[PDB]
RNA sequence: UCGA
DNA sequence: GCTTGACAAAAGTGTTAAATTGTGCTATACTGGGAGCCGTCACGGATGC
């Protein structure tokens, strides 16, 4: 089902995205899983604090160093660019997908991520009960 | 060539099947029990599916590559490469 | 739901008459081969007998019609022809399948495509390839991350055409015939020639089953004695390869594009991270853990 | 899906799917599960009209539905279908033939006189062509290489 | 010792008539031989034992300049029908070399 | 022990065996003797049992007697099966490729007293395969074994399910016959939608009788209240038409049809096992003579009563006029309801089919064949009878090639129990309920031993002390105990009978005089559920521990310290060992090796007390004290079915004295009468510089120099000279095109010379075949003129040794047609060459212990640099420490410590008062010399306290110094570095085995080779010299990297491209660049296949119209 | 069906060897009389593929069939002579 | 029927 | 350097004895097959009731 999905273009240029939990209700903390969701992403819209300092600009890789600064600013949510909102008439765009997990860098124009995602989900399936 | 955009499918009408076929197989015979040759007007018949040996008619009048694209008048086999036996189809006319 | 079929015929130009056959195409002989193997005994494809039942019953129907016959006999022959053509295209889809000796259902044209053994999942989505081999794997603790121990007999047969042209380049042998015989006979000259072509020529190692893309990695061959294969201990986590007797396969890229894809894309040193979670897949584990701890 | 719309179903699926994999200690990235989820909601039902051979109760791609719906010279709702039903609805008829239910896929394709553009990679694999991905993209394979005149002077 | 030769056997997997051991088991017993040679070039010893008894390591007649340091070693046991004729090649070297 | 030649191996067992291990091959021999009038089996049934024993043949002839023509005028009776001496000795059968059988004689009387009476005759059915003394068969020269199938016994078994409609429980009933139409409760003959009350009116039951039986607990009364019609004869017309509804039913035909379908013995065959099952289970004919046919009515009346009784829950049910029996649901897996079809019975069913297939010819012959004078000679065609036998021994899943790597694998194969086969479940059809061990498997089937593949739970090994019933239900021995005192009585109990008693634990305190010493004792109830009771209620007791575990499982020392998983691997890998050149018995091992070795049949046993007259490698002769002279020929370097060596060696001295049952010559894997599957090596457990990593193993080079791990492998090659269509095939030295140098090793006949060496590609046997017409090219046939070598009419077809093997030729076997011999039609000369080789232990070969530890050889270091004790004695194997704790098999450490304890002599001080560690200590075991053998029975073993105390012992390493402390660790010296290791390491003597998985067999390499005919892809397997399969999942990994050229290369020019592969080979040889790939041939085949289905398919260019791949597309 | 190898399937080595064999014959036959080389080409057919006969070769060169057998024998002894045939020994088969 |  | 004529072998070649091959025919009266099938499991969607 996902084998025909590849990265066609660099950026789809759309402004849509989804929200990430990112450290909820602490302290008086953080979140159990921020590496599966927030990490490796790319910021959809600017992340601003209460007074609007605009700490992290759009398109940042949202690495762990960026998460610490976001926590220090005190914002509990960030709208992130995802493949669900990506337009990209054919395939998907590199900016919406995110950082290549193996490379640690951005996704190349040739990467076929459907088969990679299928294997990423299927391989651990031997450990389920 | 291995560069063609699309491949289309569909239904084969009785005329399409007749145009594919190089002849009607009239007998349920495979090979002679003695000579082991492809007996005529059956399955494997060289008159339609092509020759067993490269550039050879069934009776052996034309054994050489000088003449190709010709059909032996006696045995009715076309002189060409034996690979045509892979691509050549027959047909059965139903009653 | 009935409209979809009625509309399908309306949009295209194919007449619905195509659903009834006035003629049955015959598959070429070489695809339904009849050949002899041991000492004259024969083996043939099932289609020939499925075709035989069709042609036999069709001709018997012509004989009944010319004589003239009661409808009981003619109609009985017609339905027999109906089931013979059915058994040819799809055997067992309607009623009991046509069985051979010992109650073995005959293979039908539809059986050729379907299933794990059909043309698709068997001979299309996968194939058996040349320039390949296999053997057991042993630890290669002294190897570099990009290196792998390669049995010398295996590499000799894998690179055979290359070492042939090399010892023909050199005067060790004349023309190509003595070169092939010199490789097959193991004569010691070719060993020094094999190390020459092996140099910086990558090979692909595979450990089945392949769950993710790291199940295949490129390495630089190192001629090694014995019949076993030396694998780097760090890549074991990727292949999930235990040293309890696992077998691995080797493939040899040929064209320049293939060799390039093995050096850049598929090199072992290039992929050290799991392309799923991102955590490093090749890291010190087991003895190295307790060794450093 | 009937309540909160398409964008929420994708959030619910990824949350539930990741919850099962997290229970066993398996850590994957949500982007992977989103790649699979994106393929389920790419189709829409056609309730009425279509204006041109778009039948009611039919599942057609959203993008292809948006282009045909222009026709200024059709109504439907987004759907949610399993991966099997989606991969069987692929525009490539021989890609579905090689996947599952080969007999049913073939009869339907032949009745509709379907045509396969040979776009996807599974098609190019079967015919022995270069898959349209990785180094097979229309750009990379056409790269031209020449030595710079400044460097050639050295020789 | 490098190679051995027996008149009745063409290979190692056959039994000699009238003896309790076989050629393979006899060779496994001959591995325990401790010989010393002063000649670089190879030389051949000889062993011939007829009738019943037990063939030991002292029954070999050594050529000039060679000796056997453990005559008590057990080789084979024969009976009235048993007859053993074998010649062995003693060589010079060091370490371990497999069968050539 | 208890065997005359038994060596001395001290056992730690705290108990004494009340029962000896029965004959382990009895399962095969007893069933076969029952089949064919064996007077040995005749006595068994006579001494205890019925006075009318009936052999398997006699009972099937009783079924066939008589044969009548339906007119009643004449009849054909069979009787008196007769057997004569076997045709040839098994050795001559295995040599000549002929089955080992004995003729069969019978008596057939043709009686027609309507006309003039006819006469009798003596008939010969055919040569009948006979089981050997080893429990095997010889079929067409190959040694085979008939396994024991697990089938569901005929009978009535009821179950309860939860309906999807409501939460209330339901009960479904199913009667299972052997040959019946199996009506189920009320679906009959697989006809759905059936009422309950139609059967009574169908049987003719009066309406008042239903109220009496079914009136209690309502139920059926309500079912009888709602019905289509109440007519007795009307119910017939209603039900008779439901099942068959075709060809309108006749009135008289429908009445007796049910009696024909069920009551009749011809259509519905009452099972002799089911008759016993249902009669006593339901209480019918309790304590009455057996051999009853299909139940008339009463039994069916009890089934419906049992069903309604099961709903009410009443335990005690008395059938009207019958007895009372508990009412409860049955479990299918309980061995009382699941029986074992033995070898003799499996063959019986095929003979029955052969006789039934014959009567169709005899019935059709007697009518239309002449008249009055025909007699059995006229037409009795035994071809279908013998065909049923021949077609069974081959092609059948139950009859398999005897698996023999070592005498252990052969023995374990014969006692195997598998549920799959004809009349049994398919592997995919089998659910997970059968695979789980049932509480009734105790002492009957071994729960540990089974396959790890798809066959888990279906295949099992019969237990040690268990034996099979005449009905097929496994029995287990037990020691009856009455009133808290163990008795000398032993009774064999089977399933249902075992649940009616409580079973004491084999391990229990025992006073000198004998009794229950403890106040509270263990037991296992009918659950089976463990229970703690008192001596008052105990009846039966286990004869000993290990009653359950099989032979292979019982051979693992310290079995109780290992997990079932690794124990299953250890037991399975024991049958995967290989015979070594000199097989030495295990230093530390359970006492099972002695008994199991002599019962495997691969050793030599003396059957008469006396004195040996002569000893030789070829044969041994014994002179009995009664004056007779017996001889035993020793199998010498015989090729096993799997390729191993069966060489035997005599252990006896010429002037020695033997005793009945004493060992004489050892087998392939044996030492002095015990099973020797491997060697005892000095093992230090530590990680060594990464060369032993994740199960990898390192060896000492001494094992290669001293051959301790060396094994012999023999291979058989075969070719025939057949009459061809164009002439006759000739075997000779005349091979047309070769250099005279390559044939130097061939004799005049053209075969290879015995004793000569060979290598891959050499000519073993030269042969030739005619060809025509030749039709030589112009280029070639120019050299024929210059070099004057006439092109031969014949084509060269020779026998060449395949890629990657070598050895010396052991022997030759040639069958000429000139010499009479025996050969099938068309073949003239048949020659077989036997090549063998001495395989040293090599890097990559698989070694494994008995506990499930396995791993390849990562490297072999020279003896100079290896961890060695202060002795200067280097170790042998280095095992990775990280693998021991995780796998949950700690027994290997125990036998490693005990292995060192038994290697060196050990002496207990004992002082005056003895160490308390020895209160329950071994008896008179305190002392022991060096290199002593010790035995640790499974569940009566050497305990932890004893092991620690045993470590303290004598350790005189040439001098006074001891090399192992009480903790079992020694300070090793690195031979490579020269300095001692920083910490103490565990060293000892373990027992490891060489496994049949070897690198020389598994290594495979290919560049170009044979291609498939329909599709141009290469083939699989090393025998075909095929290439590796690049599959669907491997293509996914190739696409994930995003490499298109590597993938296209593999699927085009590497495999299916006809013109591309030859051009690529041309480019590599010429040094040019690799050309551009083409279209895979299989795709063209795909288009042609689609066109055969009448699907119009066209590959078209983007511009214009379609194109053609070839003549058609 | 998967165990039957195609007998008529072309082997790579023999096919490549046939080309290298054609390359070698051209060089050997190239050193000879242009009229001697023509007789050998027509005799065995070579380029044409149909082996001719002495009389057919006699009409092209305008000589009797006996004169060609003399030419055929002289060129054969010159071909058997080792300078030409030393390289073709490997091609016996 | 076995090996991972 | 090539040709001649006589010359034997080979290669066809036409004609006849032969083997191989296909079809018909047999006259007491005989008239509806027998084979078989037990141990998934979960699911979807027609089709049948
Ligand atoms: Zn995007
Ligand atoms: Zn012709």
Numbering used by the authors:
A (entry chain D): 879 to 906, 910 to 1010
B (entry chain D): 4 to 98
C (entry chain D): 294 to 586
D (entry chain D): 1123 to 1195, 1202 to 1283
E (entry chain A): 51 to 150
F (entry chain C): 21 to 205, 215 to 1142
G (entry chain F): 374 to 466
What did the original publication write about this model?
Rifamycins, an important component of modern TB therapy, target the Mtb RNA polymerase (RNAP), the enzyme responsible for all transcription in the bacterium. In bacteria, transcription initiation occurs when the ∼400 kDa RNAP catalytic core enzyme (E, subunit composition α2ββ′ω) associates with the promoter specificity subunit, σA, to create the holoenzyme (EσA), which directs the enzyme to promoter DNA sites through sequence-specific recognition of the −35 and −10 promoter elements by σA domains 4 (σA4) and 2 (σA2), respectively. Initial EσA/promoter DNA recognition triggers a series of events as the enzyme unwinds 12–14 bp of DNA to form the transcriptionally competent open promoter complex (RPo)34. Recent mechanistic studies have revealed that mycobacteria RNAP exhibits unexpected differences in basic and regulated functions from those of Eco and Thermus.
Here, we present a 3.2 Å-resolution crystal structure of a full Msm RPo containing RbpA/EσA and promoter DNA containing a complete transcription bubble and a 4-mer RNA hybridized to the DNA template strand (t-strand) in the RNAP active site. We formed a complete RPo by combining Msm RbpA/EσA with a duplex promoter DNA scaffold (−37 to +13 with respect to the transcription start site at +1) but with a non-complementary transcription bubble generated by altering the sequence of the t-strand DNA from −11 to +2 plus an RNA primer complementary to the t-strand DNA from +1 to −3, yielding a 4 bp RNA/DNA hybrid. The Msm RbpA/RPo crystallized in the same space group (P21) with very similar unit cell parameters as the us-fork complex and diffraction data were collected to a resolution of 3.2 Å. The RPo structure was solved by molecular replacement and refined. There were no significant conformational differences between the two structures, which superimposed with a root-mean-square deviation (r.m.s.d.) of 0.59 Å over 2,933 α-carbons. The W-dyad forms a ‘chair’-like structure, with W287 serving as the back of the chair, and W288 as the seat, buttressing the T−12(nt) from the major groove side. The methyl group of the T−12(nt) base approaches the face of the W288 side chain at a nearly orthogonal angle, forming a favourable methyl-π interaction. The guanidino group of R290 (absolutely conserved among Group 1 σ’s) forms a cation-π interaction with the downstream face of W287, sandwiching the W287 indole side chain between the exposed T−12(nt) base with an inter-ring angle of ∼27°. R268 reaches across from the σA2 region 2.2 α-helix to make salt bridges with the −13 nt and −14 nt phosphates, positioning the R268 hydrophobic alkyl chain to interact with the underside of the W288 side chain (opposite the methyl-π interaction with the T-12(nt) base;Fig. 1c). Very weak and broken electron density for the αCTD was also observed in the Msm RPo structure, indicating very low occupancy.
